[PDB]
Amino acid sequence: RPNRLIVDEAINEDNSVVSLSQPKMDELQLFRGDTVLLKGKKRREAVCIVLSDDTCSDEKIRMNRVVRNNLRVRLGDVISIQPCPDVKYGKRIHVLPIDDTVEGITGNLFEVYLKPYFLEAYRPIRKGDIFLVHGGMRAVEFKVVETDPSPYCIVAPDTVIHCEGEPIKREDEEESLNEVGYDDIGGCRKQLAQIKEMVELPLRHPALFKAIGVKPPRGILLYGPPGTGKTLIARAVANETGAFFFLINGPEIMSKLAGESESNLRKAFEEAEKNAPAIIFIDELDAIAPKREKTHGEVERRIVSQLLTLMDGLKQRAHVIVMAATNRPNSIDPALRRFGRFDREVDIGIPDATGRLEILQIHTKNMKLADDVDLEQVANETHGHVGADLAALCSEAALQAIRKKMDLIDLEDETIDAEVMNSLAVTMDDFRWALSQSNPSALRETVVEVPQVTWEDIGGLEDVKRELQELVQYPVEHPDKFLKFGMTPSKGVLFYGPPGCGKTLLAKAIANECQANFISIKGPELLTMWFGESEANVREIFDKARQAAPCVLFFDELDSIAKARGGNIGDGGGAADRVINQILTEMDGMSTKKNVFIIGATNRPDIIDPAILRPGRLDQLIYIPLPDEKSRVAILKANLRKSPVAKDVDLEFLAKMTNGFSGADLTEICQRACKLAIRESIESEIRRERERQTNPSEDDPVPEIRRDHFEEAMRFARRSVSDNDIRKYEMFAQTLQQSRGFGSFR
Amino acid sequence: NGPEIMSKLAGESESNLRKAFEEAEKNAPAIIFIDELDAIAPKREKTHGEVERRIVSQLLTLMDGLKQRAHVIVMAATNRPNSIDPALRRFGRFDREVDIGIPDATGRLEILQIHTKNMKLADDVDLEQVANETHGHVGADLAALCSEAALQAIRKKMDLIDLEDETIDAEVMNSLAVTMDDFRWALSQSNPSALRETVVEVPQVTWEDIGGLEDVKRELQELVQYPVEHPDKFLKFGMTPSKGVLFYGPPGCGKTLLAKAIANECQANFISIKGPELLTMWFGESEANVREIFDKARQAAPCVLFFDELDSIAKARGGNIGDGGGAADRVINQILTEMDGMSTKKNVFIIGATNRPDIIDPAILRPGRLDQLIYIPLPDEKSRVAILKANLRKSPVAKDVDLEFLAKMTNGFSGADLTEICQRACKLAIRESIESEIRRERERQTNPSEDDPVPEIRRDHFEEAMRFARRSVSDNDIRKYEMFAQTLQQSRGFGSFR
Ligand SMILES: C[C@@H]1CN(C(=O)Cn2ncc(-c3cc(F)c(OCc4nnc(SC5CCCCC5)n4-c4cccnc4)cc3F)n2)C[C@H](C)O1
Ligand SMILES: C[C@@H]1CN(C(=O)Cn2ncc(-c3cc(F)c(OCc4nnc(SC5CCCCC5)n4-c4cccnc4)cc3F)n2)C[C@H](C)O1
Ligand SMILES: Nc1ncnc2c1ncn2[C@@H]1O[C@H](COP(=O)(O)OP(=O)(O)O)[C@@H](O)[C@H]1O
Ligand SMILES: Nc1ncnc2c1ncn2[C@@H]1O[C@H](COP(=O)(O)OP(=O)(O)O)[C@@H](O)[C@H]1O
Ligand SMILES: Nc1ncnc2c1ncn2[C@@H]1O[C@H](COP(=O)(O)OP(=O)(O)O)[C@@H](O)[C@H]1O
């Protein structure tokens, strides 16, 4: 029945598009772009435009917040559709801006923020419709008051659109619920989806939770580095679901009189309870409830008990949800970590490489960014920047664009608003500055991310690409077989081989394949823990992996702790040590987590204590050898990929001449070749500038890495592994290997 | 519950607690339960002042102020009461301190059964795989997993549940039928609350699982089951039963398995403090934590406190030679000191395990302490056959394989590496099965559009696994154990004159 469908989040938006599935649109009687005539809840309909994408699943209908708020529909609701593929034009379309969105910007809004949207964008034009256009550095929205066709009309230059007048006030009877929502959350889509599936039912469906019986999460402990969006995601999941959001940020209450602040918190909870669907969000819970024994006295504990008696005092039949924001909740009171008060503790974490792109896209919506800017180089370069840093970079670029145009902006008495605001056009040249003049907030936190190094990048090693794909992808794709033969899947793999041979690359590729997070604790971090007499910090790292999705917790450069103290011989102590022992102890806990696939990497395995390479722990040894001829050819081609290269070079000859070079030093050879090529190119460029400046007053002296550049780089090459070192790895492999081919009798 | 009172005005919270006790007393059979007693009465010297101690004294004067003729019982809840005020640990106030502990493997099954009563669980779900997989989950985690599975079942049926104005209650609630596919998700999306606490449990590895070693199955059944079944004889001949046994032998030869089987036989708790835990205590300069572990065994029922991989502390610092220090160290010395206290507990049967005994300080292997040495040798021919059959049990196996030939070819492989051979065979068999399954899927997808290419671990899989086998003990290492055994052994058969 195509009449009714359940709404869902849209990704294409365009301020107008409603996304269906063609195998479903055929039932909906729409093919390419036919009008939808979307039917709302109370007393309104929208024309909308039909389109499709991947996430439809032939089950759900997707609408951006413009349509959802226009139709008085919250995400997760059920709505109706009245398909009508017909074309009808209007002549008296009149629109007025919304004072809530225009309260200090004055100009020709019919021309400054309207021209690029009233044609070819297919606005949901219909009397009473409200639409956002996202103009000059502000999410300006308008309402079309009169549309003489209805409920559908052609959005085309044939239809006549008239000029507006003075701004009108927003309808306080409904408030339009603009605020924020899911569409302006980026870089934490998985965490936002987890929160949605965790909190949507109790807030949208409080009626069933009085009958269904099963207790939903009374409180959700959002946490992450400051400025990660905890407040933003909380407010989005509040407004998007229609739940009343009560912010009781810690300092606002801790600053009040002792005893009176307790009353303030209690009456905040009472305010949340008086209306069923409300949610109360406790920002900066570290201040409110830090470690109990680390508090001084009076308020710092008077609140905590007062909080606890209210945190679990609620019966959960009032439909009140207590979300909280903290930083690595190891700091908050352990008493709050109990169940019935905070039973779910999603980790937002810093945005990853491709999440910062989305954050920039959403924040750089109204800036009217120039065409030469890409926002993908900026996202990649902003490594460690938290979403707050991305917003700060956005604002800094905007301010510099204003400040590089203050000469022609202050012509009249300072700013007159006016169309001039569109001229800014923040080019890359301003982003570069903002990025270089902003300090990452969270640069010293283990970043959980899905690495974007695919199987193709790691050429050469092939038996290990299939001997490693097995352990990871077989017990997930067909777990039924593994529970039949009785074997427990091996949640442990350590790569031992010559230094710099793709261990990190192989682990990252494994993470990439099964869309899995990749937490690399490099050797220097383990040395920091060992030297610092803080091996307990290891407990956090493993926990950081546990709270995440399927995670290849990768101990890069393992055995560095032992390598830093001679090893099994040459030192008074034995093989075991602080950090390795703590890793061993905590690993056995994550031997039953069935999502984490602990990986190790070692450049010198024989010093590793054998206590870890036994069943349950990193039992499965894998040997990656130094690349062979064909493998070296593959590595050369793969690591020179994404860089210009001439047809003259034949990588087969280089590979065979590359007799005994590992992956790291082979990529070093490629980097030296590229370095010499860029030096030649820049020298030719400055020489061409010299010619330009002199009397005479062919533009590509070296448009790719030339062959003799590779010649010179190879002449400048260097190898890091000797015959004895490479033989040592195979000799060690003989320890857990055998040549018992004699027992051929089955 | 503590916070409900600690949140009230100082002096007025004292009155609230006092009137709570008065309410308990006004009716004789009432009992008062103090939840989160850590907040109410933490360590006295670690409190700051005012309420945190004003309550405690106010509690103490009421905890023992009751005459016990009013029939009021004051139960309390705490976490490892080493944290609560020691003054409350005195007698006449808290004289019995039972330890609930986390549910064991078979207890989580019952917890799931009771919590999954009203969910109307589907038929394909078993609740025993879920219980086994939920290792470390506390009962609260089991309830959370229950609720998460229920919520996912609702959420995978919200499409046909919100047909009317949201939920109309109605019969539809029976349709949920939370299948395993939802439990799997809930289990994978829940973090164990208590995963770093020594778990007291009755292990479910019976005598049958540990094949081969037989003289030790009867030389170990003796010390454990004779002084409990017929204690009258032991108090007649005068000998005190030996509450100590250390297993020394090649690494990975069933020491942990033998200790677990001993625990299983006499329905006894089994606290294994593996070598890495003792190294954590030694490195951390926190040998006092050992005092807790022994206490954790004392408060439990008959308990084989098992020091798995003992001597790891000495193995981590060279040993008796190669290091400036002597045989003794922090953790081993603390274990020795605390063990003498539990030499008169007559329920605990401290067990040790060592892969390299000669480095162990001999201070522990003398009367009262782990005096009785037991040698488990590397398995022999028949013993290797038994081990093969026992560790391939509970897994499909073909009739083609004849384990006698594998065992004899398995000339010098220990128990651990022999089970490793079996695991490699099963790994290759599962790889072959999954490869055949994906190939069959390929055939299904292509034009043509016999369902058991490999329904058991086949024989050539064992062939290849044995070709991929590996041994962890050499001739010198195995001879070292018997040479050490000669230290406390003799060949004095000359004195045949009675
Ligand atoms: C008592 C015991 C058990 N026993 C049994 O008879 C029952 N039994 N037989 C098999 C299983 C089983 C266990 C699992 F833990 C499991 O996990 C799947 C999984 N899900 N997500 C990931 S993440 C993966 C890697 C990183 C992120 C990207 C993708 N993995 C994953 C991947 C790789 C390795 N390990 C887990 C699946 C299973 F089938 N239980 C008897 C035996 C003698 O002893
Ligand atoms: C002064 C002294 C004594 N003396 C005497 O003449 C008097 N005397 N003679 C014998 C005993 C005696 C002592 C015990 F401690 C005891 O304990 C029984 C027990 N109960 N539960 C378990 S747990 C068991 C193991 C783990 C959990 C699963 C089941 N065990 C147990 C098991 C194995 C080993 N040890 C205890 C029984 C006794 F008979 N007293 C003179 C002498 C020279 O010196
Ligand atoms: N994931 C995100 N998506 C979009 N904006 C974000 C995100 N995280 C942070 N921000 C930006 O950082 C600012 C602070 O947001 P938030 O972290 O929710 O509050 P707080 O910094 O007080 O915790 C907001 O103005 C918001 O625009
Ligand atoms: N196909 C490949 N095989 C091996 N190494 C590669 C390949 N492609 C690139 N590399 C280079 O190998 C390096 C990874 O080194 P890695 O082996 O992780 O060091 P370690 O062995 O110390 O962990 C990267 O710097 C990368 O440039
Ligand atoms: N009958 C048996 N005898 C010996 N070992 C067995 C037997 N059955 C299984 N095993 C294997 O022995 C291993 C136990 O090793 P264990 O001897 O406890 O190591 P350690 O000697 O270091 O304590 C288990 O992993 C198990 O798979």
Coordinates of C-alpha atoms and ligand atoms in Angstrom, one line a residue, chain A residues 614-615, chain B residues 209-213 250-258 306 308-309 353-355 376 379 383 386-387 390-391 414-416 419 423, ligand 5:
Chain A
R614 CA 49.2 -18.8 23.1
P615 CA 45.5 -19.7 22.6
Chain B
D209 CA 37.7 -34.2 29.6
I210 CA 41.3 -34.6 31.0
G211 CA 42.3 -37.9 29.5
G212 CA 45.7 -39.5 29.7
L213 CA 47.2 -38.6 33.1
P250 CA 56.1 -29.3 30.8
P251 CA 54.2 -26.1 29.9
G252 CA 50.7 -26.6 28.7
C253 CA 50.0 -30.1 30.1
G254 CA 46.7 -29.9 31.9
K255 CA 47.6 -28.3 35.2
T256 CA 44.8 -25.8 34.9
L257 CA 42.6 -28.5 33.6
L258 CA 43.4 -30.8 36.5
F306 CA 44.8 -22.1 42.2
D308 CA 48.1 -20.9 37.8
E309 CA 51.5 -20.4 36.1
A353 CA 51.1 -24.7 38.8
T354 CA 54.6 -24.2 37.5
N355 CA 56.1 -24.7 34.0
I376 CA 52.4 -34.5 35.4
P379 CA 51.5 -37.5 27.7
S383 CA 47.6 -40.9 27.0
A386 CA 43.0 -40.2 25.2
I387 CA 43.8 -36.5 24.9
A390 CA 38.8 -35.9 24.6
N391 CA 39.7 -32.6 22.9
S414 CA 52.4 -31.8 25.0
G415 CA 48.7 -31.4 25.8
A416 CA 48.6 -27.7 24.8
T419 CA 45.1 -29.4 21.2
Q423 CA 42.5 -26.7 16.5
Ligands
LIG5 N1 43.5 -34.2 28.5 C1 44.3 -33.1 28.4 N2 45.6 -33.1 28.9 C2 46.3 -32.0 28.8 N3 45.9 -30.9 28.1 C3 44.7 -30.8 27.6 C4 43.8 -31.9 27.7 N4 42.6 -31.6 27.1 C5 42.8 -30.3 26.6 N5 44.0 -29.8 26.9 C6 44.6 -28.5 26.6 O1 45.5 -28.1 27.6 C7 45.5 -26.6 27.8 C8 45.7 -26.3 29.2 O2 47.1 -25.9 29.4 P1 47.7 -25.8 30.8 O3 48.4 -27.1 31.1 O4 46.7 -25.3 31.8 O5 48.8 -24.7 30.7 P2 49.9 -24.3 31.8 O6 50.6 -25.6 32.0 O7 50.7 -23.2 31.3 O8 49.0 -24.0 33.0 C9 44.1 -26.2 27.3 O9 44.2 -25.1 26.3 C10 43.5 -27.4 26.6 O10 43.0 -27.1 25.3

